[PDB]
């Protein structure tokens, strides 16, 4: 009976500098898409996915993370005295009776794989997801349970990648595989924010994992790579070494909202998808843009 | 020497259920225009008018308007260990160094109206400025200096209005009054959300006033008006019976944040003002709108 994949770990400890000033308070996976914040669409990934456990990786701002998912007796109380049953059932679906959320500190912000293995000890000897929220996707089902299928089936850690245009690799780990199926790579190599013409592919990493507990291991060996970070990528490198990665090219679409011009896109799709607001939206942009 | 207008009051303790769940635990008043609080435009526009004193009343969630304006010592650490020294201005330049930042409770949300009064005895006998930040705006000069000069000028409370459009006269307190120059008006009254066949004009209250301490006695007889809450247009109506009030037809521009609608308007807006993203948010639109 191999192990079933329950627990996520959601990184929200970076300085977020690109969303400054609103992000001196917030993290930037906080950022709202309308109504929403980008990790709470990250989380409900999750759930849909069969996460139950929700461990969250904090930096500067806790708070802004922590009341958002803990109950707040307050908010509840309001909107039962003034008998809002649809946005009180609204705000008890951020965190569902059977989620559990856990909280772990990056006191320095050192890097992705860094924070990654600030939450070893929560993780434990288990298979666990890295999700960065900042990466904005949507598909004919979550991308991550296409992940986990992945996962359960061939026993190997799994990175989720999509193609990217050449002159954007230098935002991106890019990998370096042989092809198993049209959207299936077996790695032999990660890079970090190649130079285009250094990048071995056109498949970048997003931020989607789902990681063997080895991974831990290897990430206590880095060194300080690409920005000075302890690079995430450079620790799957190391395990692609040892043992079995994969990259799984899945099936969705992806807005980079860690990116200003990304978040910008998400908020154009999100408001043509909600019929409170479509049409009038639509004219406006019509208007607008003549 | 009359009194000069030198304290801002920013009503930020609403309930925000228009913008749940991102609301949960931030007001409506910290929701980013792509990368800046509408409340930090807010200040800036009292900064410009010549307001060194900011009064927030804050209700759930004040932590995320108070870490936004205090100094934070993790953030300037952290970007100065990284000589980001731009970003380290910016940060500084949401609070100035001559602006103070006061903070007062309202612990129950019962109205605009109640939340001024909260602030009472910080603007003690003074006249002072009302600011909501949820009605974001712009103009050749600030709208708030505008109306700061015809106060100084007449020596009369002084209500921001536009033009409305009759259909949505129930999202408005509308005024009725006297037409003194083609952009002020000597109210005879003024009433809050009107039926469209009962408004008594086409010109709509904009969250801007510059009231005399006067208002206080009005708010404090207040009994609730329409949704159940205590409603500053109320304290406005019953002072007009007493002294004079004036409402000013600004020179600028408006984006209703209080609305998903016009919030989505204002991101678009911002967008094209920045050449870090116009041009590619520009192709973005025209592509995704065929
Ligand atoms: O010290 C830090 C730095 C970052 N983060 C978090 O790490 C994640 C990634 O940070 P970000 O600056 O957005 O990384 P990217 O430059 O976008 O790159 C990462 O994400 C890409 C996909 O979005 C991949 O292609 C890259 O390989 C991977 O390094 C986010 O959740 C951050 O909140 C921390 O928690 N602590
Ligand atoms: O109990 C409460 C209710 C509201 N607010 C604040 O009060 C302001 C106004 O709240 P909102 O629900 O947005 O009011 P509106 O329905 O938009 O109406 C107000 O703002 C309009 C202009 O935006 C005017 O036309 C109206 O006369 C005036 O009542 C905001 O700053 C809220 O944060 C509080 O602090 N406490
Ligand atoms: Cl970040
Ligand atoms: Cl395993
Ligand atoms: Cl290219
Ligand atoms: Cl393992
Ligand atoms: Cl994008
Ligand atoms: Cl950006
Ligand atoms: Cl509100
Ligand atoms: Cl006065
Ligand atoms: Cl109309
Ligand atoms: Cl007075
Ligand atoms: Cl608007
Ligand atoms: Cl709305
Ligand atoms: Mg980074
Ligand atoms: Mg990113
Ligand atoms: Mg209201
Ligand atoms: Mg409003």
């Known amino acids: 009976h191999m192990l079933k994949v329950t627990k996520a770990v959601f990184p929200v400890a970076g300085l977020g500098t690109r969303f400054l000033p609103a992000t001196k308070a917030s993290p930037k996976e906080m950022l709202p898409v309308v109504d929403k914040p980008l990790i709470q669409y990250a989380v409900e990934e999750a759930i849909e996915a069969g996460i139950t456990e929700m461990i969250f990786v904090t930096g500067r701002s806790k708070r802004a993370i922590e009341d958002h998912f803990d109950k707040s007796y307050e908010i509840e109380a309001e909107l039962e005295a003034r008998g809002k049953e649809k946005l009180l059932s609204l705000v008890r679906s951020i965190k569902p009776s059977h989620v559990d959320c856990f909280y772990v500190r990056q006191a320095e912000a050192?890097?992705?794989?860094?924070?990654?293995?600030?939450?070893?000890?929560?993780?434990?000897?288990?298979?666990?997801?890295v999700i960065l929220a900042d990466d904005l996707l949507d598909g004919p089902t979550p991308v991550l349970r296409?992940?986990?299928?992945?996962?359960?089936?061939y026993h190997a850690s799994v990175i989720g990648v999509e193609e990217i245009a050449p002159a954007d690799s230098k935002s991106y780990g890019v990998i370096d595989g042989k092809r198993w199926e049209d959207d299936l790579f077996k790695l032999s190599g990660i890079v970090e924010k190649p130079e285009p013409a250094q990048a071995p592919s056109n498949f970048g990493?997003?931020?989607?994992?789902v990681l063997k507990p080895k991974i831990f291991k290897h990430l206590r060996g880095l060194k300080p790579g690409?920005?000075?970070?302890?690079?995430?990528?450079?620790?799957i490198q190391?395990?692609?070494?040892?043992?079995?990665?994969?990259?799984?090219?899945?099936?969705?679409?992806?807005?980079?909202?860690?990116?200003?011009?990304?978040?910008?896109?998400?908020?154009?799709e999100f408001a043509l998808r909600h019929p409170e607001v479509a049409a009038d939206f639509e004219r406006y942009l019509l208007a607008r843009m003549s």
Chains 1, 2 share one sequence.
């Open 226 to 235: 690409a920005g000075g970070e302890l690079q995430l990528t450079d620790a």
């Open 238 to 268: 190391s395990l692609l070494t040892d043992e079995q990665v994969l990259a799984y090219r899945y099936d969705g679409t992806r807005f980079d909202c860690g990116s200003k011009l990304g978040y910008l896109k998400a908020t154009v």
């Open 205 to 209: 990493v997003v931020g989607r994992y």
């Open 110 to 129: 050192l890097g992705l794989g860094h924070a990654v293995l600030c939450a070893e000890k929560l993780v434990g000897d288990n298979p666990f997801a």
């Open 146 to 153: 296409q992940m986990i299928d992945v996962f359960d089936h």
